[PDB]
């Protein structure tokens, strides 16, 4: 009725529909957030998935700066080189590698 | 408040809502009772069709109102 | 930032395939396409590419023509197959830069944040290496003068890895030089 | 019943900020171009509709393609800031349209002309000359500004199609309360 | 509240102006730009989820081997012996929780 | 309300016009037409002095067309705001039209710029400085060039005037030149600009170029007139030549900093002669 | 009803069936026409893998409908 | 500008065009009047493979020039 009035309450309805819409969009925020949590834990179960596995062994002489030689677990005993940025100092005889 | 959900098949489905409800529930609803689930299907109100991020209220529906009903997706 | 980008065989061999055979579709005077690669640290590599449909326009350069849902499905398929590369940046042929690129540039930036743009010039030339590879900063400019975008230069390298060496000696094998030379091929190299 | 691709051509330019129309102007864009993207797919399952933005250049916001819905949750989030360029959109309308994937469908361009325009004749008769060669229809729809620019308009679709032409329709409307109920019949009319 | 209502609200109408204002253009902006926003958001991730998933499930074929765990090291790898008598080091674990596996 | 017009028409130029045809403006409810006829108005050089009757009616207008570029809406705000004379509540009508207007951020720039510039006026260090400061960060991630940096640049200049700071200031009045348009200004506001740069540079701490200065177009046109004995120092240091008994002259012209720091400058040339001979 | 199916290498081979037609009746036909075994056969239509328990009455094909056909392949 | 295609089969059709066309558009003339599918056209210019993709005076060709189709089997 009266404009001070109406603008009361109508102000107080639009308030309440304020927080309603408020709530709606803190659930939907929260439930994606967790979305996203489990989406990062499947990326990386998938680049997880390409992996090779390594023969485990120990390290025999060193024969020339290049060469060693080295010896498997239960396997015979091989002629191999050492990768680059491998400090070769740490290639201590029977160190495993 | 009763809705006409009519199909391209001919069939009439009467829905009973209230306005505050949003477009998903009306679909959750749907499916509850028909079985047909949300996503193979959209709505159309005399060339407007609905959203998610919309309520009932937008657009302007009324009771009683006609709604058609068109599948998506092709057969299951 | 990056120092270094090397560039490894397969992906020269297939933009000479794409410029060969864009004839099928409608005359044009270049090409464009993604490259996919890798970063260890600080320096990229690059390893796959894949076309995109592309138009242009010979004076306006306001007009022009990517598209979006082509590169966006192509990736998804790619990415289906293999899942170690990321989409890195694109490459074009012609021999100059063009006033456009920089408008295609911030564009596709937004699929990755150092886009980096590889020039490839496919008809030969005799005095030097095939291509060029160019990163995009803004600058002081001056004393005194507007702030813009544009590109620098960023140094270049073509590399190789095991199993793909093995293919390019065996096609090379008709043809072949000293690998050391006696003479007879450092004289040449001062000339 | 006919096999066609369609490209809507909006405007987002300043003057749509105002408010003739019964909410805004672009309300009223929004709920057009929801009836036309609907009739024509509706009309042939088929068929296929993209969208392009006039303001500030044109930018190709989504490749022809026959999902609907994206267009629709694209179109949000224009908030009118550009100004007008009628030709540059026209031209990479028509660059577009070179690449359907069936190249059997015909070819047409819709475009709502909701904004005064500045423009020299003698390029749009060029223009209209070139889509006379290249067999392209064109349909406009006027909207706020009827006097400043509806003798170029006039002229451009007189001679674009004529002399036994189709009669493509220029829509022009006064600042009713709906463009829905104008748009209607005369451009679209399926079957 | 009640102060609010009272001296600004209904005395000063001024104040009913900019509440109204405020209230109108926030509510609006923030529900139609966030609900649809996120809405979409989540149908895409959803879907890509999906098509992960699906991803995984071929890959766990039925044959498999028993093995133990000798020892764990972080630097998240494992050397495991295998009772095909066989000693293997490997740097990434794969489908199981890193930290619920232990020796 | 809208009887607003007619009656107040008998103010100011165009008593059948302009406020008639704002009336009409207003009546189609084309807003951007009235905003584009509003800024126009307010330029009009009529003083103007009923500016809260005005401001009463761009908040009737904004009250819902605020939709409308907020930029203009906050020019012709700070169009309104210089009128008045008191500073208190100026900054805090101010403060609660920078709270309301918040999409555009350039406009919030805009607004600092106007605070601190009132700011200044009074007492420096403790505030300008401070938002200076706290308005660079936000300047520099916009992609484009944009309006509002002259004005920015214009306060710094400013703020950095206190004169101990001479080379600091040289460098910021160059970018402001790096952002109007072609000059088109008053020409002595450009004449004088130029004096001043002239100056600041030339007592400058870390400044040895004097060959870009002197290619800058606002330097080489408005001194070709009257005051040109300082084009001619500016030369002299350029060669490198060690006579001058034209600062003699200055010291009349500019008692002011040039007749004190006579030692520096003597050893500035001093040591520029070198990388003329040694060239 | 005269359906088309084409293949990856380009062949293009018209089939003639009713829509009462279960899945398994067509893969029949193609083995019969072809000679090829009904195991290696699988068959696409408009991106969704076609399933026996259907006739074609269901996924709601019409006449003149492309169909696509991909070969079983393995190795060992 | 007539230009004459000779086929196989020992048929001379002649076609008039003009210097500002393009080969697929010629291959859409075939299609007409011939009725075979564009795809299933291929064109030989005195040895040379003409592209779909360009224009006649690409290749130089002048009023009366023979053009020999040649079919794709593969479909055996």
């Given at each position: 009725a009266d404009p001070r009035d109406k603008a009361l309450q109508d102000y107080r309805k639009k308030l309440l529909e304020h927080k309603e819409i408020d709530g709606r969009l803190k659930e939907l925020r929260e439930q994606l957030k967790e979305l996203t949590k489990q989406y990062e834990k499947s990326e990386n179960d998938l680049k997880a998935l390409q992996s090779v596995g390594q023969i485990v062994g120990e390290v025999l002489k060193q024969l020339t700066e290049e060469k060693f030689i080295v010896k498997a677990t239960n396997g015979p005993r091989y002629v191999v080189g050492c990768r680059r940025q491998l400090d070769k100092s740490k290639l201590k005889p029977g160190t495993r590698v | 408040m009763q809705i006409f959900v009519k199909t391209l098949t001919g069939k009439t489905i009467t829905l009973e809502v209230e306005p505050s409800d949003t477009i998903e529930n009306v679909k959750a609803k749907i499916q509850d009772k028909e079985g047909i689930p949300p996503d193979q299907q959209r709505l159309i109100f005399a060339g407007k069709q609905l959203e998610?991020?919309?309520?009932?209220?937008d657009y302007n529906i009324q009771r009683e109102s006609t709604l058609h009903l068109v599948l998506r997706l092709r057969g299951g | 930032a990056v120092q270094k980008v090397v560039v490894h065989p397969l992906v020269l061999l297939s933009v000479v395939d794409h410029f060969n055979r864009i004839g099928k579709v409608g005359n044009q005077k270049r090409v464009v396409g993604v490259l996919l690669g890798s970063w260890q640290k600080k320096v990229l590599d690059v390893s796959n590419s894949f076309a995109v449909p592309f138009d242009e326009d010979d004076k306006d350069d306001s007009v022009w023509f990517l598209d979006h849902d082509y590169l966006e499905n192509m990736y998804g398929m790619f990415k289906k197959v293999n899942a170690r590369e990321r989409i890195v940046g694109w490459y074009h042929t012609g021999p100059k830069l063009h006033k456009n690129d920089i408008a295609i540039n911030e564009l596709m930036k937004r699929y990755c944040p150092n886009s980096v743009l590889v020039i490839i010039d496919v008809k030969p030339k005799?005095?030097?290496?095939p291509t060029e590879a160019y990163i995009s900063v803004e600058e002081v400019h001056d004393d005194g003068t507007p702030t813009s975008k544009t590109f620098e230069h960023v140094t270049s390298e073509i590399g190789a890895e095991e199993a793909e060496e093995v293919g390019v000696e065996h096609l090379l094998r008709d043809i072949k030089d000293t690998t050391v030379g006696t003479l007879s091929q450092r004289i040449t190299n001062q000339v | 019943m006919v096999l066609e691709s369609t490209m809507v051509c909006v405007d987002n330019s300043e003057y749509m900020r105002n408010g003739d129309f019964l909410p805004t102007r672009l309300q009223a864009q929004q709920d057009a171009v929801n009836i036309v993207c609907h009739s024509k797919t509706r009309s042939n399952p088929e068929n296929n509709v993209g969208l392009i933005t006039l303001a500030n250049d044109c930018e190709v916001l989504t490749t022809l393609t026959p999902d609907t819905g994206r267009i629709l949750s694209k179109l949000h989030t224009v908030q009118p800031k550009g100004k007008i360029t009628f030709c540059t959109g026209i031209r990479v309308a028509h660059l577009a349209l070179k690449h359907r994937q069936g190249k059997n469908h015909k070819m047409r361009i819709i475009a709502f002309v909701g904004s005064p325009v500045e423009d020299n004749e003698k390029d749009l008769v060029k223009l209209a000359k070139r889509l006379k060669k290249e067999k392209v229809n064109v349909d406009i729809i006027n909207f706020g500004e009827e006097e400043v620019n509806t003798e170029k308009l006039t002229a451009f679709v007189n001679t674009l199609n004529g002399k036994d032409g189709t009669g493509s329709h220029l829509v022009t409307v006064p600042?009713?309360?709906?463009?829905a109920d104008a748009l209607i019949s005369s451009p679209i009319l399926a079957g | 509240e009640q102060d609010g209502i009272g001296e600004e609200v209904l005395k000063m109408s001024t104040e009913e102006i900019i509440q109204r204002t405020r209230l109108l253009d926030s509510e609006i902006k923030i529900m139609k730009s966030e609900v649809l926003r996120v809405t979409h958001e989540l149908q895409a991730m959803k879907d890509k989820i999906k098509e992960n998933s699906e991803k995984i499930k071929?890959?766990?074929?039925?044959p498999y081997l028993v093995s133990n765990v000798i020892e764990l090291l972080d630097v998240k790898c494992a050397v495991i012996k295998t009772s095909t008598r066989q000693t293997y080091f490997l740097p990434v674990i794969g489908l199981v929780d890193a930290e619920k596996l232990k020796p | 309300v809208p009887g607003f017009l007619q009656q107040s028409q008998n103010s100011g130029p165009g008593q059948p016009a302009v406020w008639h045809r704002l009336e009409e403006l207003y009546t189609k409810k084309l807003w951007h037409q009235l905003t584009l006829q509003v800024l126009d108005f307010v330029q009009d050089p009529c003083f103007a002095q009923g500016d809260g009757l005005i401001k009463l009616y761009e908040n009737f207008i904004s009250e819902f067309e605020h939709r409308v570029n907020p930029l203009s809406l906050v020019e012709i705000i700070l169009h309104v705001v210089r009128q008045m004379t008191d500073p208190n509540v100026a900054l805090t009508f101010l403060e609660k039209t920078r709270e309301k207007v918040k999409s555009s951020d350039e406009a919030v720039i805009l607004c600092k710029t106007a605070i601190g510039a009132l700011k200044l006026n009074i007492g420096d260090l403790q505030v300008t400085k401070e938002t200076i400061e706290d308005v660079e960060e936000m300047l520099n991630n916009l992609p484009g060039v944009t309006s509002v940096h002259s004005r920015f640049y214009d306060l710094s200049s400013k703020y950095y005037q206190?004169?101990?700071?001479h080379a600091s200031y040289y460098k910021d009045a160059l970018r402001f030149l790096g952002c109007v348009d072609i000059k088109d200004l008053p020409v002595s506001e450009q004449q004088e600009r130029a004096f001043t740069l002239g100056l600041a540079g030339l007592l400058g701490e870390g400044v040895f170029n004097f060959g870009e200065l002197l290619m800058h177009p606002v330097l080489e046109s408005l001194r070709n007139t009257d005051r040109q004995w300082l084009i001619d120092t500016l030369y002299a240091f350029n060669s490198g030549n060690?006579?001058?008994?034209?600062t003699l002259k200055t010291a009349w012209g500019q008692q002011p900093d040039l007749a004190a720091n006579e030692a520096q400058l003597l050893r500035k040339i001093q040591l520029l002669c070198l990388m003329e001979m040694t060239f």
């Open positions: - | 998610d991020g919309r309520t009932l209220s | 005799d005095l030097g290496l | 600042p009713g309360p709906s463009l | 071929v890959n766990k074929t039925l | 206190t004169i101990g700071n060690v006579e001058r008994f034209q």
